[PDB]
Design a binder for this molecule. Structure first.
Ligand SMILES: CCCCCCCCCCCCCCC(=O)OC(COC(=O)CCCCCCCCCCCC(C)C)COC(=O)CCCCCCCCCCCC(C)C
Ligand SMILES: CCCCCCCCCCCCCCC(=O)OC[C@H](COP(=O)(O)OCCN)OC(=O)CCCCCCCCCCCCCC
Ligand SMILES: CCCCCCCCCCCCCCCC(=O)OC[C@H](COP(=O)(O)OCCN)OC(=O)CCCCCCCCCCCCC
Ligand code: SF4
Lengths: 37, 60, 74, 397, 449
């Protein structure tokens, strides 16, 4: 069974955006809790 | 996938926290992999939690 | 329960460990209790180790020590 | 049915070979034969006790799986009176039959007179404290009473099921069996727990575990469920197992095997964490004996092969739906149950992993072969899947 | 007996259950107002008790040096054990394909959520420095300190938090189809768009149901080990300790069986009034009450087996401490708890064996209330009596509860009932779907005879 959104231009872009958001959040959190002191 | 990730994350969290970052002798309990008892429950709970969130969010 | 151990002096002179050799014969049937532990502990072989010995024969129950702890540890 | 006869013949061959090597071991040393026999009886007893427990539980809770294996569970339960006769050699060991048959000392520590009598050469006080409860006459009477309760429940339930074929099955008989099963499940749990405590926990009187017996019931349940899956592959073609069966009963039995495997692991881990975390000298020795002289390797093998490998393999919808894959896992689980019980019973006597005798392997194979032969003899007495049953509609979904 | 009374239609199930919520505020029945007022008054008692606890400290209770754990832990265990029965109904019966879970899964699961909410306060309230609860949780701090992770209270933090989140997500997933029916029948533009956002445009259809059914089975499969693990961990803390009564190997399974037994009594006590007050007699039949009573009897027998195992352990061992534990339970200053325990959970369950007693609705209510009191007494016996007398005779003292811990107990009852009343006012008590699906399954069974 295909996903409902299969065959959409927006799928790769939304996945990318979610990954970029996540990476940014992770780096910022890491900096504050590990390197900011 | 997320259940296995959660179980591994819980185990690694306990190991790094209590046997590597701050090594603290508590009750004479071992500071090695022989401390695998008293490490199971957190692993199981983390695995179940992440598996449940994965199921619900993936369905949605 | 084995909280306080009391022994005669004449028997003590013949064997100092007689009080400890007894009790374990009544409880386990053997002079020495073979206690077994699943937990390793720490060596402590080459480092300062702090321990206290209290002599039951010497204590008179004055309670001076309790007052001393209260003054020292607030 | 020809496959059933082949299974019976294979079980008989395994039995005669196992008894024959056990007899050769007895000639060299009587003591080794008796210690091996106690382990062999304990592992063999699981298939009949498990069959009785599942039969009563399925009567209480109607299921498609329960209707499919009801006749096979009844046949396995029916072998319980013969199992009581097999207990007689163990009884001779702890009675005054010692000093004869070549036994230097009684099979059980409580049986030995010096240990339980004041002024005795050893006179261990803890074993002496339990002398009235742990005495040869009292132990035999309780085990015999348990056998009478087990035999009466198994024979009465089988007789009512055979009667169901003749008449009055719409509400009568089915309600009666359900009522006998409900009172029976409580009697079965109490009798099995005490039987496990007397036969195995009493080997070392110094140690006692409350969870023990419940763990044996889980171990018996896994062994019987694995045995049922192996038998079902052999009887997959039998005509009544052709127009009246579907993938759903096989899938349900696979789910039950997975639940029993996780349940057994939970009971074993629960005992280990409580004893390990509460480091009290009284309960520490049992774990110390099972983690020394190579026994640690057997414990690691149970943790990996017995628990992780089945849990991952049975985590898929396929490998439980498919009978052949369910059979291969079921044979592996049975081998792991034999290893688990050897780890539970053998360290009491061997003291070293390399000290295990051929008789230790011989006694379980010979006794379980007798059990299989009797089971295959009984199951051919009556047709499988009793057609006259108000639950036959669950098989037609 | 049947689990569904005949004469039901898909429209009738939508209209009957749908009518209870969505009724105009001014048309709320007076019984709801009375019950909500009582619950709110007990909630005010709860607020006063918590405020004075925070102002003065945990010293207002009856706890002392030997008994460091008093009625706070007893009530925590009681409330957390109430929530096992609903989780069982929601998950295990789904796995077991049992057909009596359809009409009672929603209310039982709501009871689980509210009981977990009530029981989650006690770990913070009893803490002595309640505002430092976050220290148990791993969190980035400048100190570099970590939780021990080898104690059982660290396990409690992970178990209760995981249990609450999984129960909430499973309950919300079940409500998503029900929200879709409510938004369609809301009849007010503002009432719609509130159920509609919660529904997330469910638009029930094939290729949505197929994923929904698989996800529900997977969530039910994950929850069954979770609930057993939660109660086993709430049993491990006593078991890990070297206290003689506390360290028992049978504690984990026995505690799980006790939780289902106590929870089923609470579910029977609350479900029977809801069934009679609304026209839910067709949805919840006498057969549902009879089967629930049989499950309660089955788990009660396991609790009695746990007692028998404990007594056999006391008589078996030669330790002076086990023998004195038995003596103090039987003839000690707190023997009343043990005698009431033996009366309430062993003698009361024996009538349940007879079919006539299970059929009678008054008999079930009386037995369920006795079981609820007996389970509280069991927790009291396990904790307080064991803590009162220990290895050293010089450190022996009696525990006498004050009025403030009782005030907290009634306050938690009030909070629980307030949450239940708001739930029944706003959301549907009975799953609207899985009840019409039950009707579909029953009609198909009739066709195949
Ligand atoms: C001592 C620790 C004990 C650990 C207990 C482990 C067992 C609990 C497992 C959870 C249920 C998985 C069902 C999967 C599924 O839905 O299977 C379907 C078939 O569908 C499929 O093809 C595959 C589905 C994907 C499954 C992935 C699951 C994630 C991995 C697990 C991560 C675990 C955590 C801990 C890291 C059909 O199968 C079923 O649904 C049958 C369900 C049977 C319920 C089993 C109940 C467990 C009883 C033992 C529990 C013991 C206590 C101590 C926890
Ligand atoms: C409460 C906690 C622990 C639970 C442990 C048991 C594990 C339960 C989960 C596994 C489910 C297995 C798959 C489903 C199945 O095969 O059973 C369904 C069965 C038949 O249902 P139909 O398909 O025929 O539909 C009928 C209605 N339409 O339903 C049953 O009858 C239930 C089977 C019996 C359950 C056996 C568990 C007994 C628990 C023993 C506990 C021992 C404790 C020892 C200390
Ligand atoms: C090693 C061998 C195995 C031994 C196992 C021993 C332990 C077994 C315990 C089983 C307890 C069962 C209690 C009785 C429940 C009951 O009454 O059954 C009702 C149902 C529904 O069937 P219906 O409609 O009434 O009629 C069927 C015929 N048409 O069947 C069920 O089993 C589901 C009910 C819910 C199950 C409750 C038991 C859960 C036990 C949890 C505690 C476990 C402790 C570790
Ligand atoms: S100060 Fe007094 S009470 Fe304290 S140890 Fe010395 S003699 Fe005993």
């Amino acid at each position: 069974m295909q996903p409902e959104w299969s065959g959409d231009p927006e799928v790769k872009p939304v996945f990318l955006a979610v990954t970029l958001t996540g990476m940014v959040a992770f780096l910022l959190m890491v900096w504050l809790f590990a390197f900011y002191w | 996938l997320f259940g296995l990730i959660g179980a591994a994350s819980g185990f690694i969290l306990q190991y790094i926290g209590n046997l590597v970052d701050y090594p603290l002798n508590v009750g004479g309990r071992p500071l090695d992999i022989t401390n695998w008892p008293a490490m199971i429950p957190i692993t199981f709970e983390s695995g179940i939690l992440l598996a449940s969130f994965a199921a619900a969010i993936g369905m949605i | 329960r084995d909280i306080y151990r009391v022994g005669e002096f004449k028997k003590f002179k013949e064997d100092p460990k007689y009080i400890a050799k007894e009790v374990y014969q009544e409880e386990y049937g053997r002079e020495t209790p073979n206690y077994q532990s699943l937990q390793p502990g720490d060596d402590y072989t080459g480092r300062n180790a702090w321990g206290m010995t209290i002599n039951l024969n010497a204590c008179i129950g004055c309670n001076a020590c309790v007052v001393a702890c209260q003054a020292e540890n607030n | 049915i020809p496959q059933l006869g082949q299974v019976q013949m294979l079980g008989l061959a395994a039995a005669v070979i196992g008894i024959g090597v056990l007899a050769a071991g007895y000639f060299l040393s009587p003591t080794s034969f008796f210690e091996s026999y106690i382990y062999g009886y304990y592992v063999a007893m699981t298939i009949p006790l498990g069959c009785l427990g599942f039969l009563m539980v399925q009567h209480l809770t109607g299921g498609a799986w329960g209707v499919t294996v009801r006749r096979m569970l009844e046949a396995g339960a029916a072998t319980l009176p013969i199992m009581g006769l097999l207990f007689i050699p163990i009884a001779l060991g702890y009675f005054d039959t010692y000093k004869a048959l070549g036994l230097e000392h009684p099979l059980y520590e409580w049986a030995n007179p010096e240990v339980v009598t004041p002024g005795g050469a050893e006179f261990d006080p803890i074993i002496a404290h339990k002398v009235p409860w742990l005495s040869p006459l009292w132990v035999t009477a309780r085990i015999a009473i348990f056998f009478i309760i087990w035999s009466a429940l198994a024979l009465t339930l089988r007789a009512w099921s055979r009667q169901q074929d003749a008449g009055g099955d719409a509400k009568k008989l089915a309600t009666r069996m359900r009522r006998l099963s409900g009172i029976g499940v409580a009697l079965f749990v109490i009798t099995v727990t005490f039987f496990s405590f007397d036969v195995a926990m009493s080997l070392d009187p110094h140690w006692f575990s409350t969870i023990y017996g419940a763990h044996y019931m889980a171990n018996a349940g896994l062994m019987t469920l694995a045995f049922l899956a192996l038998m079902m592959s052999r009887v997959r073609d039998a005509a009544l197992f052709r127009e009246y069966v579907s993938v759903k009963p096989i899938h349900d039995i696979g789910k039950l095997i997975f639940a029993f495997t996780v349940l057994w692991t939970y009971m074993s881990y629960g005992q280990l964490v409580i004893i390990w975390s509460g480091d009290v000298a009284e309960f520490t020795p049992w774990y110390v004996h099972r983690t020394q002289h190579g026994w640690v390797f057997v414990a690691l093998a149970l943790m990996l092969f017995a628990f992780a490998l089945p849990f991952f393999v049975l985590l898929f919808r396929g490998t439980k739906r498919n009978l052949n894959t369910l059979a291969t896992i079921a044979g592996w689980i049975v081998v792991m149950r034999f290893v688990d019980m050897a780890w539970i019973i053998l360290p009491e006597f061997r003291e070293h992993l390399w000290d295990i005798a051929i008789t230790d392997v011989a006694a379980p194979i010979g006794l379980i072969g007798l059990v299989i032969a009797l089971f295959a003899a009984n199951v051919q007495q009556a047709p499988l899947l009793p057609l006259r049953d108000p639950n036959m509609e669950q098989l037609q979904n | 007996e049947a689990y569904l009374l005949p004469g039901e239609t898909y429209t009738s199930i939508s209209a009957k259950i749908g009518d209870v919520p969505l009724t105009p505020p001014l048309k709320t029945p007076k019984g709801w107002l009375a019950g909500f007022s009582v619950a709110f008054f007990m909630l005010m008692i709860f607020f006063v008790s918590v405020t004075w606890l925070f102002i003065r400290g945990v010293g207002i209770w009856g706890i002392n040096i030997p008994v460091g754990w008093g009625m706070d832990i007893i009530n925590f265990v009681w409330w957390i054990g109430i929530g096992h029965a609903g989780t069982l109904i929601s998950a295990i019966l789904l796995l077991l394909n049992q057909g009596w879970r359809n009409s009672i899964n929603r209310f039982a699961e709501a009871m689980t959520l509210f009981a977990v909410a009530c029981a989650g306060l006690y770990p913070i309230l009893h803490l002595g420095r309640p505002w430092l609860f976050y220290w148990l949780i791993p969190y980035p701090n400048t100190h570099g300190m970590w939780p021990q992770f080898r104690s059982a209270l660290a396990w409690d933090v992970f178990a209760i938090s995981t249990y609450a989140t999984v129960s909430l997500v499973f309950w919300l997933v079940g409500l998503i189809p029900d929200f879709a029916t409510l938004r369609d029948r809301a009849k007010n533009i503002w009432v719609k768009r509130l159920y509609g956002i919660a529904a997330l445009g469910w638009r029930g259809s094939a290729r949505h149901w197929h994923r929904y059914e698989m996800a529900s089975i997977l969530l039910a499969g994950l929850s069954t080990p979770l609930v057993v693990s939660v109660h086993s961990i709430i049993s491990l803390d006593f078991a890990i300790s070297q206290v003689p009564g506390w360290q028992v190997t049978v504690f984990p399974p026995y505690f799980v069986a006790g939780a289902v037994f106590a929870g089923f009594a609470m579910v029977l006590l609350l479900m029977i009034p809801v069934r009679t007050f609304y026209g839910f007699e067709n949805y919840i039949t006498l057969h549902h009450l009879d089967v629930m009573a049989k499950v309660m009897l089955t788990t009660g027998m396991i609790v009695v087996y746990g007692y028998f195992m404990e007594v056999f352990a006391s008589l078996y061992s030669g330790n002076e401490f086990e023998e004195y534990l038995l003596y103090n339970r039987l003839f000690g200053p707190s023997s009343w708890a043990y005698w009431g325990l033996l009366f309430c959970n062993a003698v009361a369950i024996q009538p349940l064996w007879f079919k006539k007693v299970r059929q009678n609705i008054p008999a079930l209510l009386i037995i369920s209330l006795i079981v609820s009191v007996g389970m509280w007494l069991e927790r009291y016996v396990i904790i307080v009596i064991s803590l009162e007398r220990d290895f050293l005779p010089s450190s022996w003292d009696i525990y006498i509860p004050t009025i403030w811990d009782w005030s907290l107990y009634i306050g938690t009852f009030g909070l629980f009932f307030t949450l239940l009343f708001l739930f029944i006012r706003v959301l549907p008590m009975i799953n609207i779907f899985e009840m019409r699906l039950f009707l579909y399954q029953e009609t198909e069974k009739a066709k195949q005879r």
